[PDB]
Amino acid sequence: MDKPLKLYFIPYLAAGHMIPLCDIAALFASRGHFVTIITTPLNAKILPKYNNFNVHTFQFPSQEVGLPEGVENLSAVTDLDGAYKIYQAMALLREHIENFVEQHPPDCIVADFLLPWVDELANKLSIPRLAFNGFSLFTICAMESLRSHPLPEDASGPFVIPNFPQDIVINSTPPAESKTFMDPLFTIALKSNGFIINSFVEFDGEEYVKYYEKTIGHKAWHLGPASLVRETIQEKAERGEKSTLSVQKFVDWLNKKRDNSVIYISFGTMCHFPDKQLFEIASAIEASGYDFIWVVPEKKGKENESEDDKEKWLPKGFEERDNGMIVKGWSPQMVILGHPAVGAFLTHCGWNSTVEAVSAGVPMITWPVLGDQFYNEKLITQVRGIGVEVGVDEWVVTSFRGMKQLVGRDCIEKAIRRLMDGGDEAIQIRERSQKLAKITKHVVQEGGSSYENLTVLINELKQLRDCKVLN
Ligand SMILES: CC1(C)[C@@H](O[C@@H]2O[C@H](CO)[C@@H](O)[C@H](O)[C@@H]2O)CC[C@@]2(C)[C@H]3C(=O)C=C4[C@@H]5C[C@@](C)(C(=O)S[C@@H]6O[C@H](CO)[C@@H](O)[C@H](O)[C@@H]6O)CC[C@]5(C)CC[C@@]4(C)[C@]3(C)CC[C@@H]12
Ligand SMILES: O=c1ccn([C@@H]2O[C@H](COP(=O)(O)OP(=O)(O)O)[C@@H](O)[C@H]2O)c(=O)[nH]1
């Protein structure tokens, strides 16, 4: 504890994995250790500089992959080809990332599971390495249970998470493609010294800290929700990217509405719905009759469209009825969710949007799409009971307009009203969300669960540093 720790963080160029890992590095920075993010210049611009907080940037190889100069992240990508370029750009940056880390070795490396070449880098440098995927520990347990007990290849439809601490049924089977990409990353990540989770034990469940530790044989570190590291308005409003609309424009409009009278609809980054699907969402939004903040990244840069191009995805007269805000880009989600007017959230069950909703105490309407979201759907609705389900069952591998099954407006509206109409069910769901909200307020504060986990994590990293100094 006499000298601080030198920690490097290598976040992947994805909004869901860049945002949380930098906030997690800000928790290390608040303790007095020298953190350092290693990413591209555009992704490091939005990062507020704390104490000890520094970045090391290598220029994004735009013309090497074939991208415009303004695209250095997966959130600005609207095509499956773009995700390949973001990955290929990460392969080219692998050279200079390894060289910089070899020239100035840190006390510890924290790297994403999407980059599995950090294993050789930390090994030859004989330094402790931490893995990060931004999933829930509950989901990580569920995906390692399917890896030990594979589903029959023919089987499809709902399935039970095998040999779990709690009987849980996921609504659809994962794609066979998902297994071939995920399993190599989990195996390399399990070769790491520890796993960093942007969650707290009161939410994932202690029976899964004991499941991951004793059944799988690996250490996890509940350090989140790291979104709580941003306290001011400017810290909450600038995340990953500058907001598209003025943050005060949202607040002045939300301040005029009642409490729990606004629905926030955002399927996160990397999810783009076809125009038919957006039409069903829009029809179900106006049919519910509730004010809404709808994030539509599918139509960013497509403002003042001709009447033909707008009727492809919106009912005629939808924008004339000013009962909501259609944001075609980044939204201050921490700000919008924090406002007392938002009382419901239509989510893709992404983990960042999930813990941010638990902090703000907003119940969630679940619409999972890919990745860890179909496990998160059941963590929201069955395990913790802070949300209702739409009832979707399409588990795509790519979400870039790839969905082949149309979710009807009668299905969406039915779920929207189950939380906005204030029924007897919705009342106690919002009570269980407020119970977790009060707990979440001080899990990163002194004495909390995730706070003390970071205290233990630092001490063990300091120990390993003191052992290397002997040699
Ligand atoms: C196969 C390919 C298209 C890949 O192309 C290959 O590249 C290698 C490079 O050496 C070559 O050797 C091959 O010949 C070939 O060209 C490029 C892109 C790519 C890698 C994958 C990809 O970009 C992302 C995912 C992604 C992984 C995962 C675990 C995430 O964590 S995504 C992440 O978090 C959440 C998760 O829900 C997202 O919502 C966030 O926005 C953020 O992106 C799960 C989801 C997903 C989409 C699974 C597929 C893949 C591994 C993908 C698209 C497979 C295809 C692959
Ligand atoms: O318009 C948007 C879209 C996304 N986000 C942020 O992007 C992250 C989305 O992460 P999540 O894991 O929920 O979705 P994923 O990016 O994995 O699809 C969260 O921090 C959101 O607050 C935001 O602030 N505004």
From TrEMBL:
InterPro entries: UDP_glucos_trans, UDP_glycos_trans_CS
GO MF term list: UDP-glucosyltransferase activity
Regions crossing the membrane: 7-29
Assigned keywords, A-Z: Glycosyltransferase, Membrane, Transferase, Transmembrane, Transmembrane helix
Xref: CDD domains: GT1_Gtf-like
Stretch forming the signal peptide: none
Pfam families reported in the protein's UniProt record: UDPGT
EC number(s) reported in the record: 2.4.1.-
Domain of life the protein comes from: Eukaryota
Enzyme type, top EC level: transferase
PROSITE patterns from the UniProt entry: UDPGT
Family of the protein in this entry: Belongs to the UDP-glycosyltransferase family.
Name listed for the protein in its UniProt record: Glycosyltransferase
Organism name: Trifolium subterraneum
